[PDB]
């Protein structure tokens, strides 16, 4: 049931790459310090998402075997996973322990950010369900890698080549669930099942962004390539 020396090597390598992301405390400190207008909050999201995509591309490039894949499939994997990775990272930040009352204010600040009520409810439903799983940093890093190397993505020419890269990451995650949560044997299937709910945000992400209570929906050229906007 224990990790092999190769799997421990793979896990620490994924962890070092995952940790190069913007610190959660840095993000929560800005949202908790001052209450911003819907216009200011849209600009905050656009800058936050641009940095996330940039760091995600660097994390994706370091995933073992990713560089050996067909260049057209590489783009298909990045484009098909960018939104899901953003929501998984947002869920991780939201569930990080904060001093008494700060998490209540964080939720209230996100509710009043500018997004339509229609989209706020399923977003918090996902964050709370991810939170009830009580995932470790290693589980978040592997799940992100598993999301990126999904063979079921649109326009993928060689599905088997993507499968071969995802399988060792799924194996490491399964072993970590058994070690971290031996009390809950449903833990690994719980995480995997939460990826289908993650996929639902892809279909409605463009509608979610355009429904933001602002006059101008301005996006960066990089965000326009990753999202179905402008």
């Amino acid at each position: 049931m224990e990790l092999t020396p190769d799997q421990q090597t793979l896990l620490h390598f994924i962890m070092d790459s995952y940790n190069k992301q913007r610190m959660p405390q840095e993000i929560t400190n800005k949202i908790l310090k001052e209450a911003f207008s819907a216009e200011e909050n849209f600009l905050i999201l656009t800058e936050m998402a641009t940095n996330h995509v940039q760091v995600l591309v660097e994390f994706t490039k370091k995933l073992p075997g990713f560089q050996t894949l067909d260049h057209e499939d590489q783009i298909a994997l990045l484009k098909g996973s960018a939104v899901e990775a953003m929501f998984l990272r947002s869920a991780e930040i939201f569930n990080k322990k904060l001093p008494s009352g700060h998490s209540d204010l964080l939720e209230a600040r996100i509710r009043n950010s500018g997004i339509s009520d229609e989209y706020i409810t399923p977003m918090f439903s996902f964050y709370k369900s991810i939170g009830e799983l009580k995932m470790t940093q290693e589980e978040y890093a592997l799940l992100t890698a598993i999301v990126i190397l999904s063979p079921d993505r649109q326009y993928i020419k060689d599905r088997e080549a993507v499968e071969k890269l995802q399988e060792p990451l799924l194996d490491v995650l399964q072993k970590l669930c058994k070690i971290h949560q031996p009390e809950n044997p449903q833990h690994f299937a719980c995480l995997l099942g939460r990826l289908t709910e993650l996929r639902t945000f892809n279909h409605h992400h463009a509608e979610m962004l355009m429904s933001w209570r602002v006059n101008d929906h301005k996006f960066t050229p990089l965000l326009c390539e990753i999202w179905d906007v402008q």
Partner: peptide
């Protein structure tokens, strides 16, 4: 079409 993504990847 996705030249910024292609650039960051390569």
């Amino acid at each position: 079409d996705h030249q910024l993504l292609r650039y960051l990847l390569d």
